[PDB]
């Protein structure tokens, strides 16, 4: 019943308030959603948001992020954003500057760069430290199935049976 309102997943207070401040200055809901989410990018909230965490099998960090305009029902989305930190920032740019919904990969990097986003490695010593111990644990866990060598015991490159 009492408006405005902000609700985020997990105990990320710094983000909740970064969103409220956005509303405080009479910012749009969209503005508030970008500020809160992006705040967790800097803080790498629980290592589940932002760079320097959750490395793929090759050790790289790739970011997904979206924002939805509830009024027009317009979406700005990035999937597999490579070498760009402000993921949701790039997402607002797809909403605001293209008639599209989702752009992905190294292609979304080139779009981000035009939008003025700084291309930079998303790796940290920590992100890699995580990658090496994994390699040492025989890539367990992983997401393959029905491939040789056995996915539950060995690291790839795998081939279909």
């Amino acid at each position: 019943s009492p408006l405005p309102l902000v609700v985020n997943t997990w105990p990320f207070k710094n983000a909740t308030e970064a969103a409220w401040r956005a509303l405080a200055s009479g910012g749009s809901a969209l503005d508030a959603v970008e500020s809160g989410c992006a705040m967790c990018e800097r803080e790498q909230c629980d290592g589940s948001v932002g760079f320097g965490g959750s490395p793929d099998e090759l050790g790289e960090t790739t970011l997904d992020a979206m924002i939805m305009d509830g009024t027009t029902m317009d979406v700005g989305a990035v999937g597999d954003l490579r070498r760009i930190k402000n993921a949701i920032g790039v997402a607002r740019k797809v909403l605001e500057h293209t008639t599209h919904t989702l752009l992905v990969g190294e292609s979304a990097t080139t779009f981000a760069q035009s939008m003025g986003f700084i291309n930079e490695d998303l790796s940290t010593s920590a992100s890699q430290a995580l990658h090496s111990d994994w390699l040492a644990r025989n890539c367990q866990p992983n997401y393959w199935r029905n491939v040789i060598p056995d996915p539950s015991k060995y690291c790839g490159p795998y081939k279909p049976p």
Binding site: N8, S54, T62, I67, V104
Partner: protein, 141 residues
């Protein structure tokens, strides 16, 4: 992932997420987070909803969209979110997933599948009455 839902005073809604995926994902993997209707969805005529958890399973059930469709009937947020979790629950009894719902009036709620390693979900809340961001919690079903 940080799923975030915002309802301005004008009554205009917004939603969004940002993540780095799940650890050790195959090079090029993209989950539910950036997918409208799955990771998050928002509609001024009904409400919004965001999701967090295993994107590979969630993405196939469009939790955020369905949560909003229930609320579009006038379903209470806690229930729309709860019904969604249950639909998935049938198919994958052990799925990791949590969703936050909020209708057009400012009513919120959340729900989560109960695993022996995930029994309660904490989410932040910020509205007038309280002011100060408040940390909510729900017991998983």
């Amino acid at each position: 992932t940080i799923g975030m839902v915002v309802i301005h005073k004008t009554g205009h809604i917004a939603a969004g997420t940002s993540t780095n995926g799940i650890k050790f994902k195959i090079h090029g993997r993209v989950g539910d987070s950036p997918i409208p209707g799955a990771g998050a969805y928002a509609d001024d005529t009904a409400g919004a909803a965001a999701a967090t958890g295993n994107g590979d399973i969630l993405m196939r059930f469009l939790p955020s969209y369905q949560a909003v469709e229930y609320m579009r009937r006038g379903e209470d947020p806690t229930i729309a979110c709860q019904k969604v979790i249950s639909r998935i629950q049938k198919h994958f009894p052990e799925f990791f997933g949590a969703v936050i719902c909020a209708n057009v009036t400012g009513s919120y709620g959340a729900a989560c599948n109960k695993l022996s390693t995930f029994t309660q979900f904490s989410f932040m809340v910020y509205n007038s009455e309280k002011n100060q961001p408040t940390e909510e919690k729900v017991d998983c079903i």
